[PDB]
Amino acid sequence: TRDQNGTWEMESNENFEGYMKALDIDFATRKIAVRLTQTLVIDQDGDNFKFKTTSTFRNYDVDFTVGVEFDEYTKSLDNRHVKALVTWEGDVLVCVQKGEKENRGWKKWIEGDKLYLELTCGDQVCRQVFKKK
Amino acid sequence: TRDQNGTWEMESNENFEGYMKALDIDFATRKIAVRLTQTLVIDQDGDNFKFKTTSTFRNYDVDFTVGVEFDEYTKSLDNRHVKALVTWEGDVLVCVQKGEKENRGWKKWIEGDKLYLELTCGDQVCRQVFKKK
Numbered sequence: 001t002r003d004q005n006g007t008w009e010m011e012s013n014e015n016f017e018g019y020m021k022a023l024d025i026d027f028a029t030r031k032i033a034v035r036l037t038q039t040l041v042i043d044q045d046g047d048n049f050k051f052k053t054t055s056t057f058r059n060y061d062v063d064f065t066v067g068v069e070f071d072e073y074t075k076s077l078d079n080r081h082v083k084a085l086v087t088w089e090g091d092v093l094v095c096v097q098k099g100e101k102e103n104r105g106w107k108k109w110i111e112g113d114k115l116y117l118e119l120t121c122g123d124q125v126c127r128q129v130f131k132k133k
Numbered sequence: 134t135r136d137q138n139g140t141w142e143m144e145s146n147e148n149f150e151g152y153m154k155a156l157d158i159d160f161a162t163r164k165i166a167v168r169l170t171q172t173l174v175i176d177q178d179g180d181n182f183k184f185k186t187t188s189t190f191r192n193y194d195v196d197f198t199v200g201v202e203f204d205e206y207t208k209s210l211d212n213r214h215v216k217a218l219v220t221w222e223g224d225v226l227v228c229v230q231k232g233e234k235e236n237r238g239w240k241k242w243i244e245g246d247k248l249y250l251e252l253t254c255g256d257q258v259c260r261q262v263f264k265k266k
């Protein structure tokens with residue numbers, strides 16, 4: 001049984017922090033790492049191996065069409081049910097989420113090879129910039 | 134352009150902490166969140182959108198051939214340089230990482246339909262079990 005190909009999902013984890021302390025990994029990093037799950041992807045072809053380990057905190061998917069108001073559940077983020085309306089205003093993707101939180105939504109657009117995201121809630125605006133891999 | 138298709142990886146994130154307290158998220162989740170990185174895949178069909186978001190703490194990618202020494206820089210973990218060599222011991226894949234840490238390496242093998250991983254460094258053994266997806 002030398003074939004280890006596949007996508008492996010962690011089931012159990014013994015003495016993880018003690019091992020990280022042996023590596024002298026700082027306390028704050030250890031306390032975040034002990035929470036998350038782990039997925040190991042192994043691509044094996046003869047004697048040539050490739051591993052990739054991902055930490056992952058939370059996943060988040062959503063599908064919609066512009067102009068169609070739809071009831072959405074903010075999976076993993078805060079687990080709230082909201083009515084969402086994504087519309088165009090020029091070539092900026094603007095969404096307003098109706099619910100128990102004041103002034104909630106986001107704005108998306110592209111300039112060059114960069115995605116520009118602005119999330120708003122209350123008087124807090126979070127500005128993120130993405131690069132295309 | 135209104136076309137936002139592609140995989141995007143976050144490169145900068147501002148006021149994410151303030152935006153999150155606006156959503157009444159506990160400070161334990163906030164400390165985990167402000168240090169991850171987000172991968173967003175956008176599937177677009179004119180006006181029908183589909184977003185897939187992944188937040189990730191750290192990644193550990195390796196590629197090697199069994200039986201040939203390879204230099205490794207453990208950025209993402211403890212940031213050390215080691216001389217790694219991977220061999221088979223029957224059905225057990227054995228790796229030795231020669232460097233500053235004593236007895237540093239790991240062992241990986243298939244048992245039943247599960248993958249077993251034992252990470253060693255000095256006196257500490259981290260044991261992990263994986264199921265196949």
Ligand SMILES: *C/C=C(C)/C=C/C=C(C)/C=C/C1=C(C)CCCC1(C)C
Pocket residue numbers: 020033038051053054055190191192193210239241250252
């Ligand atoms: C053959 C399998 C190997 C070498 C698996 C290695 C994975 C680790 C040593 C895990 C490392 C992690 C941390 C120390 C903290 C957070 C990030 C991880 C999951 C990559």
